[PDB]
Amino acid sequence: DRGVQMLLTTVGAFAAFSLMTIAVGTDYWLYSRGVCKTEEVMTHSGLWRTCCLEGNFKGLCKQIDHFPEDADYEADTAEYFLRAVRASSIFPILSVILLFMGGLCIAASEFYKTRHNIILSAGIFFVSAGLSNIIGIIVYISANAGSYSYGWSFYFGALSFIIAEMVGVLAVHMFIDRHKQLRATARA
């Protein structure tokens, strides 16, 4: 049913957008040890700040410094470029923006039924959001590399990518069905 497809597409788009927005903003990206006030204590860290867990300074969040200029070392330019990419979180934010644009396209598609290219634009935006999510995950893990566990905030982004890809698949199906019906009418 095309109505069921519409409902599933919009519900999944909103769910993926909400999950990924929570993932970007929240702080349960990674459980790791370290001082939360700049002693070794378990902490939970996100994309911007890390806060103490089960410690004397529990609850005190501290901004994450992505440029370790204590030794004033640069090494190669690739490391600096990766540091700049990770610090801005440009790819998770771009995934959020593209998911929002896909949702906007889906919402605006009902206003103009004749223009089928809006559904295609929504599908392209969703798939690009998934690709940006993949790039962001890769960049985040690579930056972390240079005992630990991943929290629900990180797994929220992982599940958000899957939902966005599934919604993009459904959106392209709607674009395919709309053009097939248009061709079917012309033959009749």
Partner 1 sequence: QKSKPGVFSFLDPLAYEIWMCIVFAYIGVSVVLFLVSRFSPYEWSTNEFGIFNSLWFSLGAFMQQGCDISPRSLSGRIVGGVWWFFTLIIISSYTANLAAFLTVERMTSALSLSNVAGVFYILVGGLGLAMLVALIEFCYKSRAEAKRM
User: 127 by DSSP, 3-state: which?
Assistant: helix
| Tokens encoding 173 | 């199906």
Give Cα separations from 142 to 14, 83, 93, 160 (angstroms). Answer: 29, 10, 18, 20
Q: Is 129 in the site for partner 1 (CB under 8 A)?
A: no
Ordered DSSP codes for 80-91: HHHHHHHHHTHH
Contact with partner 1 (CB under 8 A): which of 45, 128, 153, 160?
128
* Contact region with partner 1 (CB under 8 A), list: 11-19, 45-53, 97-105, 131-139: 131-139
Provide the residue type at 133 as one letter: N
CB of 62 to partner 1, least distance (A): 25
Contact with partner 1 (CB under 8 A): which of 12, 124, 156, 160?
124
- Residues 17 and 99 sit within 8 Å (Cβ to Cβ): yes
Q: Is 176 in the site for partner 1 (CB under 8 A)?
A: yes
| Tokens encoding 1 | 């049913």
Residues 147-166 that bind partner 1 (CB under 8 A): 158, 161-162, 165
Query: Alpha-carbon distance 146 to 95, whole Å?
Result: 24
| Tokens encoding 169 | 């698949």
| Tokens encoding 111 | 């206003």
Contact with partner 1 (CB under 8 A): which of 123, 153, 156, 160?
123
For the chain, the maximum distance between any two Cα atoms, rounded to a whole number of angstroms, is: 77
Contact with partner 1 (CB under 8 A): which of 12, 92, 103, 168?
168
Q: Is 3 in the site for partner 1 (CB under 8 A)?
A: no
Contact with partner 1 (CB under 8 A): which of 130, 153, 156, 160?
130
Question: Residue 148 half-sphere exposure, CB side, CA atoms within 13 Å?
Answer: 14
* Residue ranges binding partner 1 (CB under 8 A): 75-76, 78-79, 82, 120, 123-124, 127-128, 130-131, 134-135, 137-139, 141-142, 145-146, 158, 161-162, 165, 168-169, 172-173, 175-176, 179-180, 182-183
